[PDB]
């Protein structure tokens, strides 16, 4: 039977530490994204891009529409890798790992975290863009010419099922830490200390999900099954990017 003992209080302090660090690293949280999407915020109402005309008018608030949108997508990804790297530094034990392994964990991790957290900004209609100032519809993205039309669709399909788990920011802060500390990334030098951190993060995640979700007893198992489906999303995503690079950022340049 579950007890509030020293071990559980340390897992709760670890959960609080990751949450606090999550709030510092990521400007738009799920709590705020959900208040925007549900119209329960006093903050400015996002501009909706639902057709070509609203996109032209919206670019106000490269020659071809599909390629300008792909370029915004690519630049936001650079920013996202920086936020995730800043969060990774706050995970206890992470900065103590071989720097080469810190780089490998983030290199193979950031895409899975990007699509986990993008689900927070998605509903059935579309996705919040430019830190919650715009909203771009799923059907408008899907309307873009091949091969751009199918770029975001698998992320929406993932988000529909992922969002039905109803995770909050407290849940996601630990879940993203579990993803980063994956001992199975290729070319890791020293696996054991990564799995030791992951074990403690899995314990903290299980406890989090039991306290926070009284109505889904196997939510822990269900969340681990998703880390499996994120792999496949990232595979298809990398494949589509290779296709686009063969067929068609200020900080990168420096």
């Amino acid at each position: 039977h579950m007890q509030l003992n020293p071990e559980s209080a340390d897992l709760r302090a670890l959960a609080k530490h990751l949450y606090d660090s999550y709030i510092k690293s990521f400007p738009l949280t799920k709590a705020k994204a959900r208040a925007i999407l549900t119209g329960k915020t006093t903050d400015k109402s996002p501009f909706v891009i639902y057709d070509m005309n609203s996109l032209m008018m919206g670019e106000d608030k490269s020659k071809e529409v599909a390629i300008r949108i792909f370029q915004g997508c690519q630049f936001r990804s650079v920013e996202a890798v920086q936020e995730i790297t800043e969060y990774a530094k706050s995970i206890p034990g992470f900065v103590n790992l071989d720097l080469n392994d810190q780089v490998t964990l983030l290199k193979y991790g950031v895409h899975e975290i990007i699509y986990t957290m993008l689900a927070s900004l998605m509903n059935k209609d579309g996705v919040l863009i430019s830190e919650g100032q715009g909203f771009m519809t799923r059907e408008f993205l899907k309307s873009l010419r091949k091969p751009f039309g199918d770029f975001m669709e698998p992320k929406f399909e993932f988000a529909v099922k992922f969002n039905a788990l109803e995770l909050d920011d407290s849940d996601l802060a630990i879940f993203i830490a579990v993803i980063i500390l994956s001992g199975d990334r290729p070319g890791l030098l020293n696996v054991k200390p990564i799995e030791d951190i992951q074990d403690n993060l899995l314990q903290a995640l299980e406890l989090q999900l039991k306290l926070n979700h009284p109505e889904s007893s196997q939510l822990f198992a269900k969340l681990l099954q998703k880390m499996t489906d994120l792999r496949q999303i990232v595979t298809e995503h990398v494949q589509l990017l290779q296709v686009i690079k063969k067929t068609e950022h200020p900080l990168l340049q420096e």
């Binding site: 650079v78 890798v81 920086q82 790297t85 800043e86 530094k89 720097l99 810190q102 780089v103 983030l106 290199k107 950031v110 900080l251 990168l252």
Partner: peptide, 11 residues
């Protein structure tokens, strides 16, 4: 180029 961004952000 993913490594480039990560190494810089870790510094």
């Amino acid at each position: 180029g993913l490594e480039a961004i990560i190494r810089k952000a870790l510094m």
